[PDB]
C-alpha cells in the first residue's frame, strides 16, 4: 500500500543492503532560476543538475528545492532520526527524465520521484552559503510570489560533510505522489537569525511553521541504510 511521509527513522531497525553503491551527486551545473513563496513554503527552482548511482535505475534530474521549518528553532524538520528532530529540512526534488515525458507524468509513478532530504541545524554559526537564500526572502515576502534568484549560488555548497543515507519508499510531503526518499542524517549548520527571516513570510497570518507531522512506518515498509 501507500506509505505516508514523513516518518521517523529507527536507525536500529534500518536494514543494510550491499546492492547500494555510493550515491553520486552532480549539482556542479545547476543554477537556480526563480525563488517562490507558495503560501506554505519557500521553493527554489533549478535549471540543470542531476543525481545517479546508488540504488538508482538511472539518472534523475534536479527539478526544485523546498524549505521547511518550525515555530521554534529546536524542532522544525519533517523527518526524524530516532525521534530527534532538527531545526528544519531542505527537500531537493528530482524526477525520472530518462524514462518519462515530464515531471507532471513522473509524479504518477512510484519510480518517478526521488527527494533528497538535507537537515538544517541551528548552531552559533552564520552559514555563508545558506545566507544566499536568506538574502532573497524580502523579494518573496508576499504569498504566491515568484522572483528571480538575484545572486550567485552553488547548490553543491549546501551538501552535508557526510553523505551516508537512509532511504525508503514514501510519498511527497503533501501526499500528491509516491516518492523515494534519500535522507542524509548529518545536517548542515545555520544561525538562528537566518531561520528567523523565513517566519516573516506571509501565508495564504504568517508562515511561522510549515512542517508535516510524522506517520506510522507501515508493516511491509523497509528503511535501508548505506554506510556511505
Amino acid at each position, epitope marked *: 500500500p501507500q506509505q505516508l511521509s514523513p516518518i521517523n527513522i529507527e536507525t536500529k531497525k534500518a536494514i543494510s543492503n550491499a546492492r547500494l553503491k555510493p550515491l553520486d551527486i552532480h549539482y556542479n551545473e545547476s543554477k537556480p*532560476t526563480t525563488i517562490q513563496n*507558495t503560501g506554505k513554503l519557500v521553493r527554489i527552482n533549478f535549471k540543470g543538475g542531476y543525481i545517479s548511482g546508488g540504488f538508482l535505475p538511472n539518472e534523475y534530474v534536479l527539478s526544485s528545492l523546498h524549505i521547511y521549518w518550525g515555530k521554534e528553532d529546536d524542532y522544525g524538520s519533517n523527518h526524524l532520526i530516532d525521534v530527534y528532530k532538527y531545526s528544519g529540512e531542505i527537500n531537493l526534488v528530482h524526477w525520472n527524465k530518462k524514462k518519462y515525458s515530464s*515531471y*507532471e507524468e513522473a509524479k504518477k509513478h512510484d519510480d518517478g520521484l526521488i527527494i533528497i532530504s538535507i537537515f538544517l541545524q541551528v548552531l552559533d554559526h552564520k552559514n555563508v552559503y545558506f545566507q544566499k537564500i536568506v538574502n532573497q526572502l524580502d523579494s518573496i515576502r*508576499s*504569498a*504566491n510570489t*515568484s522572483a528571480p534568484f538575484d545572486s550567485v549560488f552553488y547548490l553543491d555548497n549546501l551538501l552535508p560533510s557526510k553523505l551516508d543515507y537512509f532511504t525508503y519508499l514514501g510519498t511527497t510531503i503533501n501526499h500528491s505522489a509516491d516518492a523515494v526518499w534519500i535522507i542524509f542524517p548529518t545536517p548542515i549548520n545555520i544561525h538562528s537569525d537566518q531561520l528567523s527571516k523565513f517566519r516573516t513570510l506571509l501565508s*495564504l497570518h504568517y508562515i511561522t511553521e510549515n512542517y508535516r507531522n510524522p506517520y506510522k512506518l507501515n508493516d511491509d515498509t523497509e528503511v535501508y541504510y548505506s554506510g556511505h
Partner: antibody
Amino acid sequence: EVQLVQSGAEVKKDLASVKVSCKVSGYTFTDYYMHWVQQAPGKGLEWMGLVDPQEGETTYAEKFQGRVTITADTSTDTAYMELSSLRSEDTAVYYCAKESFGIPHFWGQGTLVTVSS
Amino acid sequence: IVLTQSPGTLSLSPGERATLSCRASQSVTSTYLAWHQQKPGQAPRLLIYSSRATGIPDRFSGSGSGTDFTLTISRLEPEDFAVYYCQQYGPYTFGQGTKVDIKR
C-alpha cells in the same frame, strides 16, 4: 520577450462548457504562477483564480468555485480555463496572465466568450 | 477584502498632475497593493506594485499604507487618459475602477 497567445473568441449555448486556452512563450512556464481574470462588458476586472504550473495546484475565488477548472500543460506550455455550466451572465472577456511579483505582471489579450440561446 | 477607489471618475487636462486614490476596508498586510492601467478594448497593464514595473515611465508613482493608497501621475499626457484599477495582494480583490476622462 514574453508572449501570451489566448484562444479565439467563442459563442456558446446555455448549459455548455467552454475551454479557453492560453499559449505561453518566452519564459519558463513553471518558474512563475499563472492567473485568470474576468471582465464583463462595461463592468471592471474580477480575479477568478490561479495555478502553479509546476505541480498543477490551483486556488479559485469562492465566487467562481465549483463552476471553473484551471489547468496547466507543461508539455505544450499551455494554461487552460474551463467554465462548467454556462449562463447568460458569464458573457465576458477572460484574461490569462503571467505572475511576477505576487500579481498579474504580463497579461494576455483576452478571449471573448459569449453566451446566448 | 473590499476596495473602493476615488473618485467615481476623475476629469483633468494634459500637462498637469493626476492624483488617483484607492481605500480599503481592512489593513493591506505588509502594504501589498498594486495599480493597473486599462485603455479601452485592451489588455490591462501593471504600472506599480510604490514599486516601478520595468517599461513604465518616470511620470507615474504610487504610495500609501494601511487602508489608504495613492497613485500619482506628475505631468500628464494624452496616452495616460484611461481606466485605472487598484489590486490588493499578498485575496486578489480588485477596485471597482476609476475612469480618467478629459476636462472640457
